[PDB]
């Protein structure tokens, strides 16, 4: 028994299928050549609010009249929860790290939420959200540890398994592990021979360290990574699922993330945020070569497209 | 009559369909809200080589194989890449004449697809003259980016798709450079559904098409244009001008700032990495002058013509 069940994911699908489009799966002959795999890209960047977080947000809201919804977010969960709350006429307060990209801070306010900045650490996020929840008498909807959220994210895999029936592996970027855990439950329940692989920045590598050690090891210092959506540590609800049901974790460096993100931009014309480049970098990575040649058909989740163009100017690289 | 007919477009479709993408039409609630219209975006940025030019290039190569020592053209980059790809499929060397001031991303892709690149001065005259000389030197066949009939016919296949995907469209909005796409679309639309408006969108900083229509004669750009819309610096030509004169309903000019704003809006709201030239059509629908367009012209298809953007080049203006 885990904090969600397959049944939870099925119910989540029922709860949100009238509210979100089924995002496309796209392909690139070039990326296929570069990796020597048969790649399929699940385009969550086209989801309402620009990331898959709409799934968990809609599921959580439908599963909840309350005075307000509250959460902490690097931006995507915040935008998504604000939109879902607004559908129901519920006020939203989003606790956001000071260092979040401007595009995410501005979008949250565009959708009508009150934004409250916190310090960029797990502790500050959690503590400030708890206080805001107390002060507003709101309902806290955690970005990755809330069962209704995790089950919502898992619906990605229901779609993938139908869109790509012969898939051999899903590759999933991991932060708090909400998406990874929901996908792992879904894939392992329906099609256990399909691999579930996590992709994680080296600069925020708690999930990798945790799996290696076989115990939950949160990030010690606040992470600094261009993959701004996966700075969260994994938590007590998602760790057991990841521990038991995820096949392997691949870490990728800042430079690998930057190169893979630009590659998708230039070759596929999909404006993924760098956090979504993490999964692409994983498949391009040296260690991924160790993956059996039999694992041919790989679906990478392009998890979001909320990228700060003015910020991306710092690191955009000319061909060398 | 004109240098192509609808039968030419139909034939082009037969010639190329097995080799190209039927590109999607995407939408955005936000862009609808901002413009007050119901917009349909024809996503040629997902075409092979990153723009619609694969259509004209494949058509020309398939039409003109009946093999030369080489194919030659001049291009700001998109036609160059497309022709190189089409030629490579047939084992034919490519020579592309490219203005010095073309984006690096385009210069490098042409080289990556295996062509020889020859830089020219950034003018209509230099492009045409150097391409002529290279054709003669290589004993190649010249495939013009916008005045070659097989190229015009190929580009018009966009409209065949649009009219099936968006059957009750009220207007198409099309960025114009040399007028190959505009003319091919105009021919197809006015043949199949003449009540559908065909509108061109053009940078004010390269506004020969607008000036031509305004003055009722071909008025090429007098100075080399300077515009972020790097793929529409070409003047319209002798084969496309009569089609545009007679069959295009209106031309909307847009400033550099409007192009930048519309390009970023598509990036941020729709996550489609259009090049700024493809932003020209979006900026037109957002422009003050487009507000003079009747409210009954509500359902509008904009051609997102390419996605070949130089991100290093974009740093200067991205804000
Ligand atoms: N004010 C804003 N500032 C920055 N980004 C914004 C702003 N408003 C919306 N966005 C971004 O625009 C993208 C699209 O938003 P959203 O999904 O709400 O609209 P849409 O794409 O028009 O909707 P649909 O595709 O369902 O018609 C998201 O990535 C969102 O973050
Ligand atoms: N070396 C390169 N430098 C920059 N851009 C490149 C380079 N090679 C290819 N591109 C760009 O990559 C994009 C995709 O290229 P292309 O259509 O040939 O392949 P693909 O997208 O992998 O193919 P498909 O979608 O049919 O599987 C195009 O915009 C092209 O300009
Ligand atoms: Mg492609
Ligand atoms: Mg981590
Ligand atoms: Mg959208
Ligand atoms: Mg012009």
Residue numbers in the entry:
A (entry chain AAA): 4 to 67, 75 to 330
B (entry chain BBB): 4 to 69, 75 to 327
What wording appears in the published article?
Human serine racemase (hSR) catalyses racemisation of L-serine to D-serine, the latter of which is a co-agonist of the NMDA subtype of glutamate receptors that are important in synaptic plasticity, learning and memory. In mammals, D-serine is synthesised by a pyridoxal-5′-phosphate (PLP)-containing enzyme serine racemase (SR). The first mammalian structures of SR, published in 201031, revealed a dimeric structure with each subunit consisting of a small domain (residues 78–153) and a large domain (residues 4–67 and 156–316). The roles of Ser 84 and Lys 56 as the Si and Re-face acid/bases in the catalytic cycle of hSR are generally accepted.
In this paper we describe the first ‘closed’ crystal structure of hSR bound to ATP. In this structure, Tyr 121 has ‘flipped’ outwards from the core of the small domain, where it is situated in the holoenzyme structures, to form H-bonds with the α-phosphate of ATP at the dimer interface. There is a radical change in conformation of the side-chain of Tyr 121 between the malonate/ATP complex and the holo structure, with the side-chain hydroxyl group ‘moving’ approximately 10 Å from interacting with the α-phosphate of ATP to the main-chain carbonyl of Ser 84. Malonate resides in the substrate binding site with Ser 84 pointing towards the central carbon; in the transition state this carbon is planar (see quinonoid intermediate). The binding site for ATP is in a pocket between the two subunits. The adenine ring sits between Ala A117 (from the α5 helix in the small domain of the A-subunit) and Arg B277 from the large domain of the B-subunit. Residues from both the large and small domains of the A-subunit make a number of hydrogen bonds to oxygens on the ribose and the α-phosphate of ATP. The β and γ phosphates of the ATP interact with the B-subunit, accepting hydrogen bonds from residues at the N-terminus of the α2 helix (main-chain NHs from Ser B32 and Ile B33, and sidechain OHs from Ser B31 and Ser B32). A magnesium ion, coordinated by two oxygens from the β and γ phosphates of the ATP and four waters, does not directly contact the protein but helps orient the β and γ phosphates of the ATP, facilitating the interaction with the N-terminus of the α2-helix from subunit B. In the malonate/ATP ‘closed’ complex, the C-terminal residues are better ordered and Trp 325 has good density and reasonable temperature factors.
